[PDB]
Structures are given as structure tokens and as C-alpha cells.
Write a protein that binds this DNA or RNA. Structure first.
Ligand SMILES: [Mg+2]
Ligand SMILES: [Mg+2]
Ligand SMILES: [Mg+2]
Ligand SMILES: [Mg+2]
Ligand SMILES: [Mg+2]
Ligand SMILES: [Mg+2]
Ligand SMILES: [Mg+2]
Ligand SMILES: [Mg+2]
Ligand SMILES: [Mg+2]
Ligand SMILES: [Mg+2]
Ligand SMILES: [Mg+2]
Ligand SMILES: [Mg+2]
Ligand SMILES: [Mg+2]
Ligand SMILES: [Mg+2]
Ligand SMILES: [Mg+2]
Ligand SMILES: [Mg+2]
Ligand SMILES: [Mg+2]
Ligand SMILES: [Mg+2]
Ligand SMILES: [Mg+2]
Ligand SMILES: [Mg+2]
Ligand SMILES: [Mg+2]
Ligand SMILES: [Mg+2]
Ligand SMILES: [Mg+2]
Ligand SMILES: [Mg+2]
Ligand SMILES: [Mg+2]
Ligand SMILES: [Mg+2]
Ligand SMILES: [Mg+2]
Ligand SMILES: [Mg+2]
Ligand SMILES: [Zn+2]
Lengths: 148, 38
RNA sequence: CGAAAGCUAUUUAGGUAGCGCCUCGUGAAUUCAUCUCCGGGGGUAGAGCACUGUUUCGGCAAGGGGGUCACUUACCAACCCGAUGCAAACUGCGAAUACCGGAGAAUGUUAUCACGGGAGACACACGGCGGGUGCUAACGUCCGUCGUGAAGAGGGAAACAACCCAGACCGCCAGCUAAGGUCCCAAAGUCAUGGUUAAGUGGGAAACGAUGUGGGAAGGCCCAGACAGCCAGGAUGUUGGCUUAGAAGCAGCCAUCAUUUAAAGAAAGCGUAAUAGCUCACUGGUCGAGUCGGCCUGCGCGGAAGAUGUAACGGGGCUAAACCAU
RNA sequence: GGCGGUCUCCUCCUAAAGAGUAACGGAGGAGCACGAAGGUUGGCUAAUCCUGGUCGGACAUCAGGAGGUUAGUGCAAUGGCA
RNA sequence: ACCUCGAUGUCGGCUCAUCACAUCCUGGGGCUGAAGUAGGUCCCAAGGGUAUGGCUGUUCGCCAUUUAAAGUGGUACGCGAGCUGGGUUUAGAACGUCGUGAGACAGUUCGGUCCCUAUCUGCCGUGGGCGCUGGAGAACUGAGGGGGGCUGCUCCUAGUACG
């Protein structure tokens, strides 16, 4: 490994994603294959490319060293194996969705999805999301309200 | 097993052991590497 | 009182002669020795490479080998220059010792020199040191020089002329020591303090082998979780290219980048006809405080097979009754 | 022991910085030459290489320059010799 | 060139041995380029066993035929005060060879006397004496010592495992 001069970058970089981010998910990759990463990188791909991460770090000692910053709801995620996912642009989006759909294709556990932060809380798969731009679901709420 | 005076590891799996007064070599992969009189 | 086994010469070599060394007598100078100081020559030990030879690398380059009939050539190479070694018969340097001479004090039973009377001896041995020869083999051989035995008993080295300590005029049932020793055979410490070894090492032996073990100086990684386990992954261009019947991470050659990443070598090993297949490096998890491996050193381990009977401490026996220090 | 070799003289080493010092130890010479190759007097100074130069070359003779005895010595080796 | 030259008998066989282990066979193993049968190699093992003949003086070696095997060494190249006397060295003789010759040869060739009544040690046997604590007849105990320790082949297992 590297000394501190390097354990600091994995911090100053990874914590300015939290400081400058959008949504957060969860997942434990016990059996995390590489067809695994391959896929989810195309997903990050659709979800821009390299706007997304997953930098395995669940050393509390790392991606909690980014938490007493923001998201101290994660002192509780960080135990055991974890795969932290941050969003920069994009809706508070679909990121959420396929992690459940992925891991529900066996694709290993999902930490039961211990969940995360947009609010400041816990678990439950939501597509309360990428409807986003479904302001059309407030366009159809126009003419249909005007007519009916 | 080979007897020799100089014994030394051969495979990465050869191990070296001091049983009784005698120095030995045990390989878990390759029987040819057993050694004594070390 | 007290030698010699040497020199020289010898139809001489196990003989003999002169000299050397022994003894007796006589005579003679501060004569002779040791130390100190002063005055000398030296080319050995050592070192050095200008010389004489030898020798390596670099540079420079006369000259040699193929191609023409004097030119030409992906062959070898003296000198001088710079660097580095080697010498019994090399010296541009150079000791300690030794030797000659002068002076001076102390000590020594004239230890000195001469002359004369009598000799013996001219087969030496081992040990230390410097050497030649041999194999830096021989209890071998041949010089130098000192010691001892010879011609010297006594104590030590188990026993052992030649080693260590020490020079027996006679007596002593006194004492102190030397070498060497001190648990029993067996005189004297089951002594003191601090360490080491676990091998009966001590009490036979090398190259070399090895997580035995003690000590020292320094270094790397560590609760931003190290070292070892255990769960995971260990991937895409792509069988890299070349070369092969086949070289697909892995027979060889050249390259060894670039992706995707948490990390993953164009691969450290198993495997394959070649692929396939199993691991490693590396990273994520778990775990929860130390951990890794070089340097220098002490003592030990293997290596280690012999003939009548233990038979490689003299024995018993010893974990100190072994080794280091005081 | 025989067979071989050796037997006298000079020189170096072995030889341990005075002399001396052995081996069937390591290497080489001598058993002469010269009446000048002796005496004295006067005078003279080498090897090798670079440069230039007819025949001429790697090396004849000339010239200068380096060099400084690396040459010479009637014969071995040593020590000497301006 | 240290012992023996006021004698320390030499090759080979015979008889009798005895130790070592660097093990020939038999025993126990590891590895194997070990399928099996069977080998190779290293380790451990010295208990026992370990060939008759042809040729030659031989040892040896070659050859024949056996065998589980036909081991390597030490023991004055064990063993002549035990045997032999073929080899090698007495005087005879000849060949080739050298030499003028006498003669000579690790050249060859034919022929020739190996003695000793065992004092001591040792060793195989066998008695006498005394001891062992009154004398005596038996039967014992067993410290200790010695002896012995080899192996083939056929059948069954099974033409099975393996191939
Ligand atoms: Mg055992
Ligand atoms: Mg006297
Ligand atoms: Mg003499
Ligand atoms: Mg020297
Ligand atoms: Mg006198
Ligand atoms: Mg004499
Ligand atoms: Mg002698
Ligand atoms: Mg002498
Ligand atoms: Mg004495
Ligand atoms: Mg006296
Ligand atoms: Mg006393
Ligand atoms: Mg003492
Ligand atoms: Mg005592
Ligand atoms: Mg004590
Ligand atoms: Mg011992
Ligand atoms: Mg041994
Ligand atoms: Mg001298
Ligand atoms: Mg001297
Ligand atoms: Mg010319
Ligand atoms: Mg003698
Ligand atoms: Mg006699
Ligand atoms: Mg006799
Ligand atoms: Mg054995
Ligand atoms: Mg005999
Ligand atoms: Mg006869
Ligand atoms: Mg008889
Ligand atoms: Mg059949
Ligand atoms: Mg079948
Ligand atoms: Zn191995």
C-alpha cells in the first residue's frame, strides 16, 4: 500500500463528492465478480460514465473518514464489507433502482441495502425518481384538469 | 527421499522442518523434494 | 671441570689430519661479556613498478590475416599515455634485528688472549623461528639460528628422550611456590559474582547446508487496522508481437503498454499436445497489536563409514565437575 | 646399490640488509685472448625515437630535435664506469 | 628408511577361522521416468546364509552349469613350531638373447631334503586342593555365559487386482 500522502487523497477526493453530490446507495459484494463491475460501469456509463463511482473502502477508517463530514448516518453502514456509490449530476435517480434489480438477479447480497442519504435515513427501494422530468405527469395534469 | 548434505527449498511449497536432530524438507506438491541429513 | 657429532682436506664418506669445542699448567693487558650513549656500512622483512621481466582494462596505434599486383578488408595487435596486480636470481625506496668500532657505570671467581701438556669428537635427534627440496606430505630431506635430549634426575602433558615448569653435594615425617590443577579414583574451591551451550557440545574433521539460540547497530510496515489465517475477487484489448506442427500469462526472442478498476504482472509457480484447469503477486472484507527481513557478532546442529572389546574426557561420572570474564 | 650424472675454477640466487653458510636446489660461464686489446699524453661521448632529406625500404649515410647511457665494455654473471 | 640383517619364512592352495560394513541374498523403508511382473536409486539393517566345475602355479580372469545369493574389505596381502610345495631364489642342463670370455636375463625350459617331544600365555577337555563358618545326603533358585537365527519350489487366494 501507500503511506498517508495517499490515504489522504482517497479522502480529499472522495469526500468532495459528498460535499458536492446528490444521492447515496448501498451494497455488500461478497462474491463480487468482475462481470459485476463491468456491467455497473456501463450503468455508471448510462448514468453518465465516470460521474459515479463505487470505490470499495468500507474501512470506516476511510469512507467514514469522509462521513463526520456529511452523511453521519453511515457510522452504521460502514461495518463489514461495503460498496459506497455517490452521485454528482443526474436525478436523485435510478442508481437506486438497479442496485435492487441487479442484486435481485442473485448478483450477490445488497447489505439488505442498509440504505443512506438524500433525506438522512435508511432503507426502502424507491422509484420516487426519474419520473423526474415526468413533469409531463403535470402536463397531462393540465389539459385533463382543464377538460375533465 | 533425497539425503544430501545441503538441503534447501526447491518449490515455493517446499517447507523445511527440524524433526529429531535432523533437518528436513517437506513438499506438499512434489514428493521428489523430500530431503534429510541436512 | 666437561665436550662433539662442525669446518677444511682426504681411493674420503661408519677412518684420518689441522682448525673448532673439553681439560691441566704458565703468563698477560680493565683483557671479555651484559646495558646505556656515540660513530659506521647495509639492501633482508615490508613496500613499490622508474629499471629488468610479467599482467588486466581503457586510449592511441606502428605491425600481422582476406582483396588486387602498389591499393584494399564487420580479423589480431608492440610502443608511449592513463589505471591495476605479480618477482628467489626486479629496486627510483626501506626498517626491526644483527655486526664492527669508541666512551662510560655496575656486575661477573679471568668469564679474555696467548703459549704449552693431555684429550675426545668429526653417525646426531626433536622443538621454535627464517628458508631450499617434497605435496607449506612424512617421526622425510638439506642449510641458518636458538632451545632441549645426547651427557639431566625431579613436577606437569593418562602412559610419552626431544614439549611445559625446573638444573638433584648429603640428611629432614618443616615451610613457600613454578608448570599444571582443586566432585570420586587423586594432593587442593562441589569457591564468589555476571554471562553463554542442551549439543555429552565440552571429549576428532572441510566446502557447504539450516525459522537452533544469546548479544549489537541500523531499517521497513503498523488502530487512517500492519504480519498470518479466513471470505471474496484476481478482469477487457488479447492467443501482444515474433517463432513454432502447436508457444493462447507461462520452450525461446523482442516488447512489456493501455484499458476497467478497490486491485489484478502483456505474468511469480503448478498444469496443457496446445487451449482448458489450479495458484501467486495485487486489492476489497474479516480479524485486532504488534510485525517483517537484511548487517555485524557469541555458543551450538547436520555434513561424520572400519575392521579382537566400550576404545576420539585416562575411568567413574558431569548440565556444570562445560565455555567466557573478574 | 647399479645404470645416468657429477668431481677443479668464476658469476647470480637459495643466504635470513657484516663475513660465512647445505642439498642429485634454481640459472650460466672458465681451462683464454691482447706486444696493444699494456703505459702515458691530447681529444672525443652513446641507445632509441620524432621531423626533413636522391636512389632508400621498418631498419644503411645526412640534418635538426627529443632522450640522457636504456649504448659500450675482447667472452659468463654481478658489481662498476662520464 | 623409524623397528628386525648374533634370521622378523615369501606367492597360491588346504584346514581352521575371526572382525568391519562402503549389504551379494534374505528383512524394513523413501523416491521412481513405480500400471502389473520386474527394475533403478537412496535410507535403515551385520541375525543367518553367501556354487560345483574346465583352463592356468595362480590369486584373478574367461568359460560351462547352478543358486535366494555366489558381497567388498581387516586380521604380518589371518593361518608352513597345522599340512602342501605347483610359483619364486641353492648347486645340474638347454634354447633365444647379450658378451671376445668367465658369465648373464621380470626370457623361457626339464630336474631338486619345509626340522623342532610345547616351559609360559592362549585355547579345548578333565580332575586335585581349599574356601563358602558344626557335619552330612539330595533337590533347587538362575546373576551370568554359550548355542541356535538360512532359504527354494509347488498348490490354494487367483488367472481375481492390474493390464
Ligand atoms: Mg523419528
Ligand atoms: Mg658445570
Ligand atoms: Mg655430518
Ligand atoms: Mg616479499
Ligand atoms: Mg688461565
Ligand atoms: Mg667424518
Ligand atoms: Mg629426522
Ligand atoms: Mg645440522
Ligand atoms: Mg626430562
Ligand atoms: Mg644442585
Ligand atoms: Mg602451599
Ligand atoms: Mg595455572
Ligand atoms: Mg580430593
Ligand atoms: Mg558450585
Ligand atoms: Mg564428541
Ligand atoms: Mg560417524
Ligand atoms: Mg650477506
Ligand atoms: Mg644475518
Ligand atoms: Mg631513412
Ligand atoms: Mg631405520
Ligand atoms: Mg634379532
Ligand atoms: Mg629366529
Ligand atoms: Mg548402513
Ligand atoms: Mg599372508
Ligand atoms: Mg618346483
Ligand atoms: Mg613339518
Ligand atoms: Mg489369459
Ligand atoms: Mg479384465
Ligand atoms: Zn517442491
Amino acid at each position: 500500500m501507500a503511506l498517508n500522502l495517499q490515504d489522504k487523497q482517497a479522502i480529499v477526493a472522495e469526500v468532495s463528492e459528498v460535499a458536492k453530490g446528490a444521492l447515496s446507495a448501498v451494497v455488500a459484494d461478497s462474491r463480487g465478480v468482475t462481470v459485476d463491475k463491468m456491467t455497473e460501469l456501463r450503468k455508471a456509463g448510462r448514468e453518465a460514465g465516470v460521474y459515479m463511482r463505487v470505490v470499495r473502502n468500507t474501512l470506516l477508517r476511510r469512507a467514514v473518514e469522509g462521513t463526520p463530514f456529511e452523511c453521519l448516518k453511515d457510522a452504521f453502514v460502514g461495518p463489514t464489507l461495503i460498496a459506497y456509490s455517490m452521485e454528482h449530476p443526474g436525478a436523485a435517480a435510478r442508481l437506486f433502482k438497479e442496485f435492487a434489480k441487479a442484486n435481485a438477479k442473485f448478483e450477490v447480497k445488497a447489505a439488505a441495502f442498509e440504505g443512506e442519504l438524500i433525506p438522512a435515513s435508511q432503507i426502502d427501494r424507491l422509484a420516487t425518481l426519474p419520473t423526474y422530468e415526468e413533469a409531463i405527469a403535470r402536463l397531462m395534469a393540465t389539459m385533463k384538469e382543464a377538460s375533465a | 527421499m533425497k539425503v544430501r548434505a545441503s538441503v534447501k527449498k526447491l518449490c515455493r511449497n517446499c517447507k523445511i522442518v527440524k524433526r529429531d536432530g535432523v533437518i528436513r524438507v517437506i513438499c506438499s506438491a512434489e514428493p521428489k523434494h523430500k530431503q534429510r541429513q541436512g
